[PDB]
Structure formats: C-alpha cells, structure tokens
Amino acid sequence: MQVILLDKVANLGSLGDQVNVKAGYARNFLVPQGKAVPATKKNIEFFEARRAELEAKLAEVLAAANARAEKINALETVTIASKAGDEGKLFGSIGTRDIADAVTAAGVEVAKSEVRLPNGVLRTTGEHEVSFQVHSEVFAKVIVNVVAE
Amino acid sequence: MRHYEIVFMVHPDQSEQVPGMIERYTAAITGAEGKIHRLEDWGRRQLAYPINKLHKAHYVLMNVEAPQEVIDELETTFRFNDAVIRSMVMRTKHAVTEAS
Amino acid sequence: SRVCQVTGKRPVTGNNRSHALNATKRRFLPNLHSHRFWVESEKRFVTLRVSAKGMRVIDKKGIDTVLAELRARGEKY
Amino acid sequence: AVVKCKPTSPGRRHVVKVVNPELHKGKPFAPLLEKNSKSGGRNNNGRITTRHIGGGHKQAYRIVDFKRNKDGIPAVVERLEYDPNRSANIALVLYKDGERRYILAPKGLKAGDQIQSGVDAAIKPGNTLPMRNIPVGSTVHNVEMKPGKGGQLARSAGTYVQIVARDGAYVTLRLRSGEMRKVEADCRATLGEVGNAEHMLRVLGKAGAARWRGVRPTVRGTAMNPVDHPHGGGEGRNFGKHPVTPWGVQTKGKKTRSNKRTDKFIVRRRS
RNA sequence: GUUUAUUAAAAACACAGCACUGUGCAAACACGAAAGUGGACGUAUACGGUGUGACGCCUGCCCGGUGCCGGGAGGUUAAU
C-alpha cells in the first residue's frame, strides 16, 4: 500500500513512512481511527506542506496535553469504600465503569476505553496497581486501595 | 446443651482475618446462650503433610458448650466456606483446660 | 437479493462440465460480504454488502466518490 | 408415590402411575398463563418437518421465570403446580414485594420453604446465584450458557450438573450425559437437583398414554416401500441393507456434530 | 384399534414395553437456492432415527467381507 502514516506506530511508524502494509491493516485500523490516510497522488501533496510542517507538531503537543492529562491527578490513588462481604469475599466485582467514574469525579478526566486492568476484575480486596492508556509509551501507576466496609 | 470441642485450620492470609471470625463465632455462641471456655489460639505453624498447598496453616481450638441446632448451623458455615479448611467437632467428656 | 452495491455484480448461470463433458446447469455466485465502512465525509458507519473486487475498487478510489456514485445511481447508503 | 395399578381390564395391567400427593388440586395462577397453539410438526411452509407428533390433549403455556432478575429479595414458595409442557413440576412462589412467579421446583422443596436470589444467596438448595460464590464440587441446576440468557441446562426431571473445575473466569462442568464442557463463571445456576425424580418410572401402560400426550405411532422401515424408505421391499421380511435414515444419512453410529464454533468449550466428548 | 374407498379385515400395519445410535442448544434432523420456521417457547428422566414387540426364562460364538468409530507413524494424493 502507498498509505502515508500520521501516528507514531510502535512497530513501523516514524511520522512519515511509506512502509508497505496489508490492506486489512490499513482499511480496518489505520483509516477509521485516524491513524493514517491512503495516499494516491493528492494526499502526498496534502501531507507535503499542510500536515508534516504544522499538524505533526500539533499531534506532538496533543500528546504532551495527554501527558498533562495524566499529570492532572498528583495523588494517583483511589480509595474504594464499597460494601463488602464478611471477612473478604467482596459483594460485587468492580469493572472499568466505577473506576472510570471515581477517577473522573476526582482526578483524571480520561474516558472509560483507556482504562486497563492488569489483575482482572479485582475480586481481591486490597492494594492493586492499575495502569491507564493515556499515551502509547508513558503509562500510569495508579494505586487503587480497595477497602472493605 | 453438649460440650463441643471444635478444631479448625485456616489459610495464612485469611489467618490474618481470624479474630473477626472469632468475634462472629462467639456472637453465635452468645446466641446459643453458652459460655466460651477455651479462647487459646494455637496459631500459625507447620503442617505434617501437603493439605491444599502453601503449608504452615493456622490451628484454632474453640471447646464451647452449645446445643445441636447452633452447632448444625455453625458446621454448615464451616463446610460452605473457603476459609475454614478441616474443622471438626468432638465429644463432651467433661470439657478441658490448660496445657494443650 | 445478491446484487453488489458498487460494481453491480449478480449471479449468472453456467455449465458444470465434468470429465465426460456432462452439461449440468449451476449458478455462479459473487463473493459478497457485508462490511461496515468508516466514512470521513459523513463521519459515520455505512454497512454495505459488496464484492471483494468492489472492495479493491474502494481501496483504489475515495469513499466519497463511491458514495457519490451510489447517490447518482439512487442507491441507499 | 409410585403406584402400580391392578389389572382390572386389558390395558390397566402395565399402568404404573407416578402420583405425587403434594401437588395442588386446583386451577393455576391465571395472569401467568398464555396460549400455546399446537403445530403438529409443521413449519411455516406447511409441510411436515419433525414427524410422528400430533394430536393429544390441549395445554396452555405457563410463564416460568428463568432469569431470576430479582436480587436480595426473600421468596416464600406458595404452592406446587403440574406443568404439562415439562417433565418435572413447577412452583408458584410468592415473593416479598407481592409478585407471584413460576420457578422450577427442586427436590427438597415443600409448601412453606424460604428461598432467595442474588450473590448474597446461601448454599441452601433452591437459591439462584452466579457461579463465583458456589463452592466447587456441589450440585447445581438451571445453568445459563451466557450471562443473562436465562438458563439452558439441567431443567428436566432429575437432571443435575456437578461443578468440576474453576479455571479463572471459566467453569468446567460435567454434564448429565458425561460431556466435560467449559462455561462462563458469570452465568447463574440454581442449587440442588431438579424434583419429580420418579417421572422416569412411569411406563405408561397403553397406547392411549402415548396418543393423548402427543406421541404418534412410528412406522418401521421394513414395513415401508422402496419409494418411501431406503429399506423395505423383498418377498417377506427382507432387510439386507445397512441402517440409514429415510433421507439417506447413515444411522446407528455417525458423528454429525459439525458446527466448529463451540468446540473450544467442549473438553471431553460423551463416552 | 387401523389397513388395500370399489374382489384381500388378516398371521398384515400399528401398539405401551426393551435395546442400539446421534445430539450440551444458533443441538441433531427436516421444509426452504436463502431468509425464516418446526423440533421447542422443549433441552440428556428430552428429542430424532433404527430393530423388536406385553409377561416369565433368556439372547451363545465370530471383526474374515461390508457398514460405523478412533489413531495418525509410513506410502499415495487433486486444486495453489
């Protein structure tokens, strides 16, 4: 494919490459997410002066703004005080919804889709490490303290 | 009421949660209108053979006078729990004292 | 029916000629697939049951040109 | 109990009736009944598809609550009713908030027992709860295939499923036929065995118990014609062929299980 | 009980019972180019097909050929 790239792909993308990829990767991942634009004799002219000169640094400062959005919450901890069972065995498993609402109500205003859970649905009541996908390289180290009630 | 000598083993990170279970069990004892006799926690020590691995389990003796309905409910709370592994209830034989 | 939206492909009839040249009428069916396209001119999802050759044509052309051809032919998108 | 009838006439000699004396003798709860129109084995095209059914006594559909969407609510079992579309009995249960619902009646259930539902349900039989608070090794029934489906497994009379393994978010179950299969741990199940376990002991006595139930007499392949069946023909009880279906598919041993979508869930096949 | 309406009412068909086989649900199978239905608003004490035909005594041998199932070591093997 002659598809020019826009985002910093961690495998082959380095902001302006013409690396040959398959059509299923470009049509289903790169185009609908805004990661890359198919270049056929006019998008090359669009990327030549209007995109690589101004909008690449705009994407870089939007990545810096995502880093600042990570740097909004300086505490980087969430104390969940939901209702629990008798001596452990928590009542309801907390998914990404309640964690996203607790971080959004006080701290980072990131959406639910960037929230990732390394240790499952967090059935064990205690200290847990939760990372956020605010950026493709820099990750979060949120310390969630599940407290039994 | 009959004297029932309860011995049960607990897993270690849930043996950190043993005194709350002791408070719940003595609340059931207070509901049984019986007096507790042996609050001697034997403690966390080494097992003799692999019983559902991560060794050195927690021994607790109870030795309380109780009726039959309360001990049936307290045995169903034993068998239906992942924390209580190997509980047992023994005879009366004029229930006993120190130097275990 | 099995009509491609972009290229207009439709099933035709042919012969299933064996080793003894036995003419048996059968039907040639196109490789139709219902794929969901992201449209940037409309910024939305468009579900189209198209052929894979039509998918290669859309891989060549722009999606706005394909939707303009569907608007010119009066097709629903 | 299981009462064998006396041979008062030719036909009552082999009648063995499964008489449950605890069933309610009366009309069921009317807002939980709807119509159940008979089909006779015919599709929308009007041709027969599932043969050898038709006729028999009428029946009305009972809306049996499968999902048990109420959570944290006590439930007092009002009475036991006989569902004609099932093999086991159903239970009319009066909830705490005043809503009467039909559920599947387990084995250890009488008039006056108290059950509940939710994740805070106990291990007493009759309670419906998901498969993440159940101790591994017990007996469950009314097993959902997907979270929120309602229940597909272990709902005939006497059928029970025993929990074998718990691998993370997967529950490996041994089914009634003996097929090890993995399901989702978020699916719900009702504890205990399904009641009316003597229902297999009825041997129906006569042809009439087959006729008024909906079981039509089956014609053998040897009695048929070569144009009607692949078997048949010959000048007097000639078989001379291999056992096949009437549509040319081999029977008496042929694996037709071919979907290739749920083969990951199946661990060990039926033996 | 049913059957060749209009030469055969029977030992024929069928029957509850018994055995084999398949099927873990969007099940098998069937109608339908397909959608969609029956099965079933049932789900392994259920359904479909096959063989036999209450009940008592029972059902002995053989995998050579054919049919079915399993295993892929090896030979052969089209389409690309």
DSSP letters along A43-103, please? HHHHIIIIITTTHHHHHHHHHHHHHHHHTT-SS-EEEE-----TTS--SS---HHHHHHHH
Beta carbons of A14 and A53 less than 8 angstroms apart: no
Any chain B CB within 8 A of the CB of A87? yes
DSSP string, B19-57: HHHHHHHHHHHHHTT--B----EEEE---SS-SSSS---
CA proximity to C34, closest of C61, C6, C62: C6
Task: Give me the domain span that covers residue B16.
Answer: 1-92
Task: Give me the domain span that covers residue C69.
Answer: 1-77
Residue D231 burial (C-beta neighbours within 10 Å; 0-12, 13-18, 19+): buried
CATH level 3 topology of D195-271: Ribosomal protein L2; domain 3 (4.10.950)
Residue B60 burial (C-beta neighbours within 10 Å; 0-12, 13-18, 19+): buried
| Domains in chain C, number | 1
- Judge: C59–A38 Cβ closer than 8 Å, yes or no: yes
Report if residue B70 sits inside a domain: yes
Per the entry, the structure determination technique was cryo-EM
Task: Tell if D122 CB is < 7 Å from nucleic strand E.
Answer: no
Q: What's the CA gap between B41 and B25, in Å, rounded?
A: 14
DSSP string, A11-23: SS-SSS------H
Q: What's the CA gap between D161 and D176, in Å, rounded?
A: 6
Q: What's the CA gap between D79 and C36, in Å, rounded?
A: 53
| Domains in chain B, number | 1
What number of other Cβ atoms are within 10 A of residue D185's Cβ? 16
In one-letter notation, the amino acid at residue C58 is: I
CA proximity to D157, closest of D111, D88, D227, D91: D88
Q: What's the CA gap between D104 and D247, in Å, rounded?
A: 38
Q: What's the CA gap between D208 and D253, in Å, rounded?
A: 32
The residue whose CA lies nearest the C1' of nucleotide E41 is: D61
Architecture of domain A69-148: Roll (3.10)
What CATH number belongs to D1-113? 2.40.50.140
Q: After which residues is chain B broken (C to N over 2.5 A)?
A: none
Instruction: Tokens for D128, please give them.
Output: 């419906």
CA proximity to D180, closest of D154, D155, D162, D158: D162
Select from C33, C59, C66 the residue whose CB has the most chain A CBs within 10 Å, as the one to mutate to test that interface.
C59
How do the domains of chain D map onto residue ranges? Answer: 1-113, 117-194, 195-271
In one-letter notation, the amino acid at residue B75 is: E
Helices B18-31 and B68-79: crossing angle in degrees, nearest 10, is: 160
Task: Tell if D174 CB is < 7 Å from nucleic strand E.
Answer: no
Nucleotide nearest D266 (Cα, C1'): E24
Q: What's the CA gap between B77 and B72, in Å, rounded?
A: 9
Instruction: Tokens for B54, please give them.
Output: 């991560």
Kindly report the CATH number assigned to the domain that includes residue C1.
2.30.170.40
Q: Angle at Cα A59 formed by Cα A58 and Cα A65, nearest 5°?
A: 90
Beta carbons of D141 and D193 less than 8 angstroms apart: yes
In one-letter notation, the amino acid at residue A118 is: P
Q: What's the CA gap between A11 and D173, in Å, rounded?
A: 42
